[PDB]
Amino acid sequence: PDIFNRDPRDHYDLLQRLGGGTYGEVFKARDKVSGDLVALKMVKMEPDDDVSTLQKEILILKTCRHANIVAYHGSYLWLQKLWICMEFCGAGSLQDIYQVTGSLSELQISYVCREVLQGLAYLHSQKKIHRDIKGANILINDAGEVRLADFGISAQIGAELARRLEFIGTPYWMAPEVAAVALKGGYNELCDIWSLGITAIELAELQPPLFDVHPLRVLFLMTKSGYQPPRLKEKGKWSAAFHNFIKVTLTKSPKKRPSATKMLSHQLVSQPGLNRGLILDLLDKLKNP
Amino acid sequence: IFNRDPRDHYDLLQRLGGGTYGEVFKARDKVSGDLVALKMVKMEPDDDVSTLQKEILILKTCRHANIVAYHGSYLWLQKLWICMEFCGAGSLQDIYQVTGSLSELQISYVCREVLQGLAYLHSQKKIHRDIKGANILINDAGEVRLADFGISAQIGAELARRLEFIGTPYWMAPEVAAVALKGGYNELCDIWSLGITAIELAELQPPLFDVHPLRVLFLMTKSGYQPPRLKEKGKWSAAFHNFIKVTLTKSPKKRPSATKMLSHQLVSQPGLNRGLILDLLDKLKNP
Numbered sequence: 345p346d347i348f349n350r351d352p353r354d355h356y357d358l359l360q361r362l363g364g365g366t367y368g369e370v371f372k373a374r375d376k377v378s379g380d381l382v383a384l385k386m387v388k389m390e391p392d393d394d395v396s397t398l399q400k401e402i403l404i405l406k407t408c409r410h411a412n413i414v415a416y417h418g419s420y421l422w423l424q425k426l427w428i429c430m431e432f433c434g435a436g437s438l439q440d441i442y443q444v445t446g447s448l449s450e451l452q453i454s455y456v457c458r459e460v461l462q463g464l465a466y467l468h469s470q471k472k473i474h475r476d477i478k479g480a481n482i483l484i485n486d487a488g489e490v491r492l493a494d495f496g497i498s499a500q501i502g503a504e505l506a507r508r509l510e511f512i513g514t515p516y517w518m519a520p521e522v523a524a525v526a527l528k529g530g531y532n533e534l535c536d537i538w539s540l541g542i543t544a545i546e547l548a549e550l551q552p553p554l555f556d557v558h559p560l561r562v563l564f565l566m567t568k569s570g571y572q573p574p575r576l577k578e579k580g581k582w583s584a585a586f587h588n589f590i591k592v593t594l595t596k597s598p599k600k601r602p603s604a605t606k607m608l609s610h611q612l613v614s615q616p617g618l619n620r621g622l623i624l625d626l627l628d629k630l631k632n633p
Numbered sequence: 634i635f636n637r638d639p640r641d642h643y644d645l646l647q648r649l650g651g652g653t654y655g656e657v658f659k660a661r662d663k664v665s666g667d668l669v670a671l672k673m674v675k676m677e678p679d680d681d682v683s684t685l686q687k688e689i690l691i692l693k694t695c696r697h698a699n700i701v702a703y704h705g706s707y708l709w710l711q712k713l714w715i716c717m718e719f720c721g722a723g724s725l726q727d728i729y730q731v732t733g734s735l736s737e738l739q740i741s742y743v744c745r746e747v748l749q750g751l752a753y754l755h756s757q758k759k760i761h762r763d764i765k766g767a768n769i770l771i772n773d774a775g776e777v778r779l780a781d782f783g784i785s786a787q788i789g790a791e792l793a794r795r796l797e798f799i800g801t802p803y804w805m806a807p808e809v810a811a812v813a814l815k816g817g818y819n820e821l822c823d824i825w826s827l828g829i830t831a832i833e834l835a836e837l838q839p840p841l842f843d844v845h846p847l848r849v850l851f852l853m854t855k856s857g858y859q860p861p862r863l864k865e866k867g868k869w870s871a872a873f874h875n876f877i878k879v880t881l882t883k884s885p886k887k888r889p890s891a892t893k894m895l896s897h898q899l900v901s902q903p904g905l906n907r908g909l910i911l912d913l914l915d916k917l918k919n920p
């Protein structure tokens with residue numbers, strides 16, 4: 345992996361802040377000569393970080409190439425700030441879209457779900473977990489194509505990791521099994537399938553289930569023995585295949601819950617007429633209400 | 634939970650310490666003159682009073698000699714106060730920082746009393762989650778009490794910090810939520826932590842204290858991870874080395890219970906009593 349030890353401000357002009365958090369910032373940026381629009385993700389680098397692990401993580405981003413995953417172009421390390429140059433998605437997230445357009449149609453949701461599953465089946469074949477499938481992390485380009493934004497780079501380095509360590513507290517008295525869970529958590533690969541189920545409801549209804557209920561209460565209810573997975577609110581609005589998609593994706597037991605490959609053979613996402621045109625209609629609704 | 638003012642019951646003397654768990658004061662009883670520890674916990678607006686009542690009933694019922702005694706609770710001006718037994722010599726950390734390292738017999742006594750505390754807690758289906766020198770308290774009689782900060786974790790600032798840390802749960806799968814709440818802590822993790830504490834008391838620091846915490850977490854999770862040991866071999870007996878070996882079993886399935894550990898030579902030997910700690914408190918007063 346060629347991490348360029350140079351200022352990215354020489355190569356790109358930063359236009360507009362798209363978003364950010366503790367990890368750092370993501371900008372819309374223009375290439376100075378070539379004129380390509382890119383997404384430039386600034387990641388804050390703390391002084392006692394392994395450069396070898398950073399190299400392995402950028403190598404993981406370089407090797408992770410797939411149509412439904414946002415493309416990696418290159419890296420810059422300059423003044424304890426890692427910059428990751430990526431594919432720009434000009435319509436933002438599905439969240440940004442649905443907040444203006446209102447709820448997606450069933451065919452639109454079916455197309456989105458197929459493309460996310462294609463993305464997830466690839467990530468799971470590489471022994472990765474997305475960990476955060478939601479409307480806000482599914483990006484849409486001007487062509488109506490679907491890309492997953494991958495925030496996994498911030499987990500292994502920088503301020504997001506430093507904040508995770510502060511929350512976990514001192515580890516010196518902690519047992520191996522407790523340390524294992526502090527790093528990993530409950531995240532396995534099939535948790536992304538659950539999250540997609542919730543996302544499909546989110547796109548259908550403008551909120552995930554229990555969005556107005558307090559988060560601790562939701563967490564307690566999810567962990568009970570007789571917890572009932574959520575459902576679509578209106579039954580008649582949606583077809584039997586869409587209800588079944590939600591039913592199988594929201595299987596409570598991880599052992600019984602179907603994989604991304606399994607889900608790609610489901611009726612909802614395997615039907616004909618699912619293409620980017622459906623999202624071009626959505627982007628037209630956004631522009632001309 | 635008494636809706637009276639705790640100012641009517643107690644006068645707050647001196648701040649003992651603080652954190653996310655809350656502020657803790659030394660306080661005197663107005664009538665009886667008895668000294669107590671009053672743990673102030675700030676109440677956030679979206680805290681379930683019904684769950685707080687169920688948690689305090691668990692604290693009220695959990696009575697044992699080696700656990701800090703619960704006297705009562707007072708809710709006044711969006712501040713939960715938890716009145717508890719006072720331990721006038723502070724933590725073992727506060728002590729060893731002045732006295733230096735504990736002797737083997739002193740550590741053996743401490744370990745017996747912690748294990749008595751833990752065997753009780755585990756019989757009640759609880760986990761302490763935080764066994765260390767700073768949370769093992771010593772009264773003026775040289776007796777050993779476990780401080781329980783678990784009550785503060787489910788409400789107030791510690792709850793608000795937990796929720797910020799986990800993030801929004803609405804897209805989260807049941808198995809992921811389960812682990813976000815539980816956090817890997819089972820009952821036998823307290824036995825590991827006591828093993829580390831025994832080294833801490835022996836050497837003034839846990840193992841790997843100068844190593845970065847993330848690095849320690851990674852090393853602990855590797856296949857060939859070697860549990861720590863006491864640095865000096867000749868200073869400590871074979872029974873103390875064995876105590877550290879069995880308590881620091883890597884596999885939770887193979888690691889012995891608190892009841893099992895109470896029959897171990899180190900903690901089952903004669904001459905383990907509070908006198909050992911009264912000598913330590915005398916060393917603290919006159920070095």
Ligand SMILES: COc1cc2c(cc1Nc1ncc(C(N)=O)c(Nc3ccccc3)n1)CN(C)CC2
Pocket residue numbers: 362363364370383414430431432433434435436437440483493494
């Ligand atoms: C016109 O493009 C947008 C607009 C808005 C967003 C996003 C975009 N595009 C966009 N494309 C590509 C990426 C990428 N390679 O990861 C990205 N990342 C990103 C942005 C922000 C935060 C966190 C990650 N973002 C975000 N919304 C919150 C407000 C508007």
Ligand SMILES: COc1cc2c(cc1Nc1ncc(C(N)=O)c(Nc3ccccc3)n1)CN(C)CC2
Pocket residue numbers: 649650651657670701717718719720721722723724727767770780781
């Ligand atoms: C003279 O008593 C002390 C002195 C010092 C401390 C503690 C005590 N007593 C003491 N007794 C009982 C308790 C209890 N019901 O849980 C307690 N809580 C507590 C624990 C941890 C921290 C701060 C408070 N504290 C703490 N040290 C860190 C500094 C000095």
